[PDB]
Amino acid sequence: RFLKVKNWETEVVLTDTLHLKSTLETGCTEYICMGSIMHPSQHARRPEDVATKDQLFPLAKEFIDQYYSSIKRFGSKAHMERLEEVNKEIDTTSTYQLKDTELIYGAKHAWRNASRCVGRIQWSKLQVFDARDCTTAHGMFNYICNHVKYATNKGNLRSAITIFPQRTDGKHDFRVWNSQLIRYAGYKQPDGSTLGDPANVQFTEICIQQGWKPPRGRFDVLPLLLQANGNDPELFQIPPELVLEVPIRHPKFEWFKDLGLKWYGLPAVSNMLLEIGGLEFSACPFSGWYMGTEIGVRDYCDNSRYNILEEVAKKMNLDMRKTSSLWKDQALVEINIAVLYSFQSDKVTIVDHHSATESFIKHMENEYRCRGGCPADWVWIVPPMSGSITPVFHQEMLNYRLTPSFEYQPDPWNTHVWK
């Protein structure tokens, strides 16, 4: 059945047929909505490790069919032969291998399918680095360094994904143990408080426990912790010259630069899993450019993060006596003004939440026009500040799960059998 979505600010209605292709459960039922659960479902597509032939082949035949349908070649010579080819590979190795073209289509369509991503207007501009030949942590580190250098591009950032060998039996997983390629360290204090970034206290302590000598500051770039083919992970320090960083100053308040804050320029998620025709790529660092709110709202102001609202209000001469002065809201805007101004001053790519949300509505129209729909997750698309004065707030959205996709995966130290 068709389904309609409406924008209550413009009354534009869109009709969704794409959802008929959705594959995995969302977690919801007709009696219960789970649209604010972080991980609602666990509906995978095969047993975690090596499926049987009748379990893996259907998923592959699905993806190949879709890819050749994409390129106006359904049922053609290449398509029929490829099916037989994947049959014989599965028969002989219990898995199969993607062509380079199929790998790129797959990567680009996982992004296009990422319902939580406000940035997807860019989806077809992704640069894919094939690292499926990699065999060691050292090689993993080389591929990552090149990723970082390409994607940073001196501040004119470029979207990229690097794809390491697919999972095979689960014992031989490639993993980036860091959650992002570049994050700051968090240090548990003697008095019980925390220095650096609290999100990373546990990882930061794994690194120290692994032999990292922490400089023990507020903005200590963490080492890379890389796992190849199921071995114990290994530490690597990213060459500093490759880590672009922006000092936060404020266009008006000169005292702001004296708060001593900076953030890195490149967001690069490295703990997610990419899924293409039954194949699972457990290591696939991908990177873009920040929306300003990701730094200034969440990274700086969350309570279990940097928590600098506290101080920015003091230096602003604000009534911190009661909430109704809205001192939190007022500092929160100034901080985000500063992040945007600092990144733009240093000609480092960044997008504000007004431009980004506007782009996503344009993207949404585009998709409904040519594709029959566009999975979008209102809870994540709406920026965490000034929600209702952005155009996505008044936009109805359908959420559903298309493949290929990015998926979550457990932290490798919960499941790693050490050597």
Ligand X SMILES: C[C@H](O)[C@H](O)[C@H]1CNc2nc(N)[nH]c(=O)c2N1
Ligand Y SMILES: Cc1cc(N)nc2cc(-c3cccc(CN)c3)c(F)cc12
Alpha helices in 165-230 (DSSP H): 201-209
What is the x/- site pattern for ligand HEM, positions 108-127, by CB under 6 A? ---x--x-xxxx--x---x-
What is the x/- site pattern for ligand X, positions 362-381, by CB under 6 A? ----------------xxx-
CB of 161 to ligand HEM, least distance (A): 5
Residue 399: phi and psi, rounded to 5, are -105, 135
Q: How far apart are CA 264 and CA 243, in angstroms?
A: 7
Peptide bond into 47 cis (omega under 30): no
Residue 127: phi and psi, rounded to 5, are -95, 120
Q: Closest Cα to residue 115, out of 30, 26, 190?
A: 26
CB of 81 to a second copy, least distance (A): 32
CB of 298 to ligand Y, least distance (A): 7
Beta bridge partners of 24: 401
* Count of residues near ligand HEM by CB under 6 A: 19
* Count of residues near ligand X by CB under 6 A: 11
Indicate whether 379 belongs to the interface with ligand Y (CB under 6 A): no
36 is in an annotated binding site: yes
Number of other CB atoms surrounding residue 403 within 10 Å: 22
Task: Single out the segment in contact with ligand Y by CB under 6 A; choices: 71-79, 244-252, 286-294, 304-312.
Answer: 286-294
Tokens of 314: 């003091």
- Please report, as residue ranges, which positions from 350 to 409 form the binding site for ligand HEM (by CB under 6 A): 351, 356, 380, 406
Q: Closest Cα to residue 170, out of 91, 223, 61, 94?
A: 94
Active site residue 120: yes
Specify the 3-state DSSP secondary structure of 245.
Answer: strand
Indicate whether 287 belongs to the interface with ligand Y (CB under 6 A): yes
* Count of residues near ligand Y by CB under 6 A: 9
- Residues contacting 417, CB < 8 A, separation 6+: none
The binder of ligand X chosen from 227, 395, 403, 405 (CB under 6 A):
395
Beta bridge partners of 264: 245
Q: How far apart are CA 326 and CA 74, in angstroms?
A: 59
Residue 270: phi and psi, rounded to 5, are -125, 5
Peptide bond into 267 cis (omega under 30): no
Specify the 3-state DSSP secondary structure of 88.
Answer: helix
- Residues contacting 404, CB < 8 A, separation 6+: 63, 106, 107, 109, 110, 113, 274, 275, 276, 277
Beta bridge partners of 286: 161, 269
Active site residue 1: no
Please tell me which residue in 45, 102, 117, 249 is annotated as part of the active site.
Answer: 117
CB of 291 to ligand Y, least distance (A): 5
Indicate whether 394 belongs to the interface with ligand X (CB under 6 A): yes
Tell the residue number behind the tokens 């069919």, with chain if given: 65
289 is in an annotated binding site: yes
Q: How far apart are CA 23 and CA 41, in angstroms?
A: 12
- Please report, as residue ranges, which positions from 295 to 334 form the binding site for a second copy (by CB under 8 A): 297-298, 301-304, 309, 323-326, 328-330, 332-333
What is the x/- site pattern for ligand X, positions 26-65, by CB under 6 A? ----------x-x---------------------------
Binding partner at 354 among ligand HEM, a second copy, ligand Y, none, C-beta below 5 to 8 Å by kind: a second copy
Indicate whether 33 belongs to the interface with Zn ion (CB under 5 A): yes
Indicate whether 165 belongs to the interface with ligand HEM (CB under 6 A): no
Closer of 80 and 333 to a second copy (Cβ): 333
Number of other CB atoms surrounding residue 60 within 10 Å: 22
- Please report, as residue ranges, which positions from 365 to 394 form the binding site for a second copy (by CB under 8 A): 378-379, 382-389, 393
**Footprint of a second copy on this chain (CB under 8 A)?**
3, 5-6, 8-9, 19, 22-38, 292, 297-298, 301-304, 309, 323-326, 328-330, 332-333, 336-337, 340-341, 344, 352, 354-355, 378-379, 382-389, 393, 395-401
Q: Which residues are annotated as a binding site?
A: 36, 117, 180, 289-290, 294, 379-380, 393, 408
Q: Which residues are annotated as a binding site for heme b?
A: 117, 408
Active site residues: 117, 120, 289, 294
**Footprint of ligand Y on this chain (CB under 6 A)?**
267, 269, 272, 286-288, 290-291, 294
